[PDB]
Amino acid sequence: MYDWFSEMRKKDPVYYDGNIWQVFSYRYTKEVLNNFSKFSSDLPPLHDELRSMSADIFSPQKLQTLETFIRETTRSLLDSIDPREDDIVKKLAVPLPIIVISKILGLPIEDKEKFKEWSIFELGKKYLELIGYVKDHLSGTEVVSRLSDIEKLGYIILLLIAGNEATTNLISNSVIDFTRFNLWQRIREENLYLKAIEEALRYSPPVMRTVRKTKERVKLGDQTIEEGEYVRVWIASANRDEEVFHDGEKFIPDRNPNPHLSFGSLHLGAPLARLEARIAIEEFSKRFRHIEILDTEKVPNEVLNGYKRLVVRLK
Numbered sequence: 106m107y108d109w110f111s112e113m114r115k116k117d118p119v120y121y122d123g124n125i126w127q128v129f130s131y132r133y134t135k136e137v138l139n140n141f142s143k144f145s146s147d148l149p150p151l152h153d154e155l156r157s158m159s160a161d162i163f164s165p166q167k168l169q170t171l172e173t174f175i176r177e178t179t180r181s182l183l184d185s186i187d188p189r190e191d192d193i194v195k196k197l198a199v200p201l202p203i204i205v206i207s208k209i210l211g212l213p214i215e216d217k218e219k220f221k222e223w224s225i226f227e228l229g230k231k232y233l234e235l236i237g238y239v240k241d242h243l244s245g246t247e248v249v250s251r252l253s254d255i256e257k258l259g260y261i262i263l264l265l266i267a268g269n270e271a272t273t274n275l276i277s278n279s280v281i282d283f284t285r286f287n288l289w290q291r292i293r294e295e296n297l298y299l300k301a302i303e304e305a306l307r308y309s310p311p312v313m314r315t316v317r318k319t320k321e322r323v324k325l326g327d328q329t330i331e332e333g334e335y336v337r338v339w340i341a342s343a344n345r346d347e348e349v350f351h352d353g354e355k356f357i358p359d360r361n362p363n364p365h366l367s368f369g370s371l372h373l374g375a376p377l378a379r380l381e382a383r384i385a386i387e388e389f390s391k392r393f394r395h396i397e398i399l400d401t402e403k404v405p406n407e408v409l410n411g412y413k414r415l416v417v418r419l420k
């Protein structure tokens with residue numbers, strides 16, 4: 106996949122295959138995402154309400170308060186791992202983000218957490234019960250419904266939960282990358298957790314690509330695209346651009362600065378994702394002097410970069 110990106114960056118940065126436009130290089134990838142006037146995400150107050158809530162619940166002071174909870178949750182999750190043979194995705198990568206968002210949203214843990222995680226009129230009742238939890242715990246969108254406002258809140262709740270899949274993938278991708286390149290001891294001894302997670306974001310981005318729609322007739326590079334044309338933007342490719350990232354195919358855990366476009370356009374749950382991953386790796390690296398990878402299964406999706414299974418043995 107990345108060899109294809111290399112050649113396309115070299116020979117056709119902006120490319121039309123007959124069906125859809127595709128962008129591979131960093132400069133043009135960045136331009137498409139940031140130039141929101143020319144390139145649309147459609148095909149805003151709901152977005153602004155999301156941004157307003159993200160400020161409230163993902164503030165630096167709120168996340169700094171949660172650090173100890175996240176650590177103990179992580180620590181508790183690792184205790185249920187079988188050192189001889191066990192799945193990292195099932196035991197750590199999937200649970201931690203859901204437990205942490207459940208603490209933030211105020212979703213019920215324990216017996217209801219098993220049932221609520223798994224989840225028309227019976228479903229609708231649970232959907233309203235779900236909203237009721239967040240309503241009770243909390244922000245503009247919570248207070249405004251304390252029917253369109255109710256659906257708006259329900260929609261944002263689903264988003265805030267759903268986004269944690271990429272965080273799950275980042276943890277898994279990090280474990281794979283640090284193990285294959287044998288970086289654990291180095292990251293541990295040199296305190297590269299922060300940068301190594303960012304390098305894992307650049308190198309193994311949970312979201313491989315995104316789409317934009319041309320608002321007007323625009324020109325990018327040598328090419329010129331018309332209105333109503335969908336522009337595929339390969340984030341994974343942009344992250345390996347040689348001009349921006351020297352030795353772009355190399356995994357450098359102390360790479361700094363690392364202006365990857367893995368989060369896209371500011372992304373709301375990025376500080377949260379980073380924190381969860383940082384603490385996940387830190388606590389995990391403490392329990393394992395040695396990590397052997399036995400079996401892996403990728404997620405069957407061209408858009409997402411992650412693992413359905415990651416079976417490991419620990420010392």
Ligand code: HEM
Nearest residue numbers: 264265268269271272275311312315367368369370374378
């Ligand atoms: C490693 C973790 C994550 C990665 C790599 C990631 C990546 C992305 C990317 C690439 C986009 C598309 C943005 C664009 O097209 O410009 C996106 C959108 C979004 N992500 Fe994430 N994401 C992560 C975690 C989360 C989390 C934890 C949440 C919520 C709790 C979240 C909520 C969203 C939402 C709501 C959108 C659409 C609206 C927006 O861009 O603000 N994501 N994400």
